[PDB]
Design a protein around this ligand. Structure first.
Ligand code: ATP
Ligand code: MG
Ligand code: ZN
Lengths: 405, 127, 140, 70
């Protein structure tokens, strides 16, 4: 009877099991989300999630995790001195927007200075997988830069160790129906660009490593390198279209490409990434709203957009609870039809997880509904790089794993 | 096409919704020779479709997909020759249009399972 | 000696990386087997050069990109001085006016950024213009 | 009853509204097509179709349509 009553308006719904939820719970799910209510927080925590924007180097940046990452090194004598970079007042919800260079500097306790040791890398991978499975993620994509972690071992060795750690983590937690991993993790390599110095050779090395890794591991039920990223400093002189010749080989190989564009750049950088670098996903496309034609093109081309609300508020600053950076673009992106997702960016330095990200996404734009959250989940499911069979299995799992109110 | 797309905007009415790149094709008339001309069309935000694969290898299809930004491919019969390009077309969601009568008359295919090769419709559905 | 190989042509169920690793492992073990000559050095030292082959028609650019990426990764992987290493890349295959060296600059930009030696087949079936393009546009 | 019967295969179906079909009818929609059968031709003719590649300049070239255009 539930299916028969809601058989109409089914294709507008984001999933299949949404229909079997009674008129009362559908009306509840259409009401705007209230992040203050403990019931809403519990429901969001219990929701199965899909993660697309998570950096491996920004997990253990503050707190006891550092000690758990620090007390795993093969040679503790080589470890740098334990220094915790101070955070400004009210770090989760800072009163003033803060720049990007100090934002990168805040994660100095982890990354190159700490993940150079293989034991720390393995412990970081295990802790990140445990955090992801605790958050309820059924599918995540982790970005890493193996070439930054090489002194005597090749960056290929670093990538192989990272994938082996994630594979053993997946094999260990063989929960869930069908004998499948609780969370499936893929890899995306980051091509960092800096204001000055040597970075293009590192970008070429990362692209070659990504192509070789994608061609090496082809098991569908295994961690695979499924894409590349172009992150780092961005401005007029570091636009995406300066990197066509480096990326064309990737386009020869047939590898997914994700691009950071619009964090502190106008819509011109977004257009360059979309139409000259062929980005399949755009990270932090906050400046997409200025151009209507580009918004329509991104909508009809099915190009995903990844938004992290904590990072956007900390960097650009936004008004909370409807009280000049402009309104947060979640709602107009959702209304215009562009495929929009909510992610974590750096879990550690932001000191937040996916549940906090979704709750604060509701907080930033009043009027957001839980149906909008399910729509974001469907957008993340469609926009991720995965096989068609994996997409169907993830759709079935997420449809059958949404908790009742 | 750009002026017509800007002129008529009624959704419940006839509109010009895309441009085409048709005509005779060869090594000297690939899609990459029209990038500067199609830059304005991409800037205006209009759909683009291309003919490629009927009498040429997968390189023309790659050019139509990757530096002309085509959303659909016309008569991409050679796409089976390129596994990586086929996977890129599959994951990018780019549509491929096939005309059975035109392909049968022009290139020629075997009917009822009786060397142009096999018609790739079933394979294209499979991948 | 510098032996040129195309491991991507030998990959049907094992990766081209696995083929390259097997080739270099065979070369290194056969090196260590023949420990003749003074100073404890191998009798013959062989390094690898990856082949990027170009055809008259078909699909070969993806193969070229795969070979270049594999060569870069292999060069960064094995750095031991007294061992078999990948030392450069090649641009071989059919040659004419429409498959000269200067049509291949964009994917060789990554190899030049990485700092890897480049060698090109030129002058076999082309005039001095092809050699000029290889020398000055691809930096062989 | 039909829709509850075939609920678990809904994502495979291209259109949701055809999930209210019979198990026998759905089995009829799974075996290979027979272009020679008049029933299959009638069903294909009655199907709603979407067209994306049609040249206006090559429509009325022979038959009575040419004379009617002329
Ligand atoms: N929101 C963002 N916008 C732009 N660039 C970012 C953002 N978040 C991270 N980055 C950059 O992307 C890089 C990817 O992280 P990665 O794990 O490779 O580095 P890391 O270990 O933190 O070390 P390092 O930052 O010192 O290179 C980060 O180092 C940072 O430089
Ligand atoms: Mg860092
Ligand atoms: Zn990122």
């Amino acid at each position: 009877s539930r299916i028969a009553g809601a058989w109409e308006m089914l294709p507008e719904l984001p999933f299949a099991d949404l229909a079997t939820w009674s008129e009362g719970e559908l009306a509840w799910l259409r009401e705007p989300l209230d992040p203050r209510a403990p019931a809403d927080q519990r429901w969001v925590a219990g929701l199965p999630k899909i993660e697309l924007h998570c950096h491996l180097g920004g997990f253990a940046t503050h707190g006891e995790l550092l000690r758990r990452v620090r007390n795993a090194a093969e040679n503790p004598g080589k470890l740098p001195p334990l220094e915790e970079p101070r955070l400004p007042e009210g770090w989760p919800l800072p009163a003033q927007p803060i720049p990007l260079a100090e934002y990168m500097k805040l994660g100095n306790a982890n990354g190159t200075a700490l993940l150079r040791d293989p034991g720390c890398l393995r412990e970081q991978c295990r802790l990140l997988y445990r955090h992801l499975v605790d958050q309820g993620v059924c599918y995540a994509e982790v970005r890493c830069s193996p070439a930054n972690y090489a002194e005597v071992r090749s960056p290929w060795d670093v990538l192989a160790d990272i994938r082996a750690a994630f594979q053993e983590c997946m094999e260990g937690a063989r929960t869930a129906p069908g004998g499948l991993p609780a969370c499936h993790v893929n890899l995306i390599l980051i091509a960092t660009r800096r204001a000055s110095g040597d970075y293009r050779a590192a970008i070429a090395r990362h692209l070659a490593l990504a192509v070789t890794a994608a061609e090496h591991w082809r098991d569908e039920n295994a961690c695979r390198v499924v894409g590349v990223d172009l992150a780092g400093y961005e401005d007029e002189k570091t636009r995406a279209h300066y990197f066509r010749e480096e990326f064309t080989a990737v386009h020869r190989c047939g590898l997914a490409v994700t691009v950071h564009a619009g964090e502190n750049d106008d819509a011109e950088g977004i257009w360059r990434a979309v139409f000259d670098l062929n980005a399949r996903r755009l990270g932090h496309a906050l400046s997409l709203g200025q151009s209507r034609e580009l918004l329509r093109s991104v909508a009809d081309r099915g190009i995903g957009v990844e938004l992290c609300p904590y990072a956007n508020l900390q960097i650009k600053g936004f008004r909370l609870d409807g009280s000049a950076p402009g309104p947060y673009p979640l709602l107009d992106y959702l209304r215009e039809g562009v495929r929009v997702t909510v992610n974590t960016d750096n879990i550690g330095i932001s000191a937040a997880s996916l549940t906090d990200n979704l709750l604060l996404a509701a907080r930033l734009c009043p009027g957001l509904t839980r149906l909008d959250l399910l729509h974001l989940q469907r957008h993340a499911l469609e926009t991720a790089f995965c096989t068609a069979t994996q997409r169907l299995t993830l759709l079935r799992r997420i449809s059958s794993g949404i908790p009742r109110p």
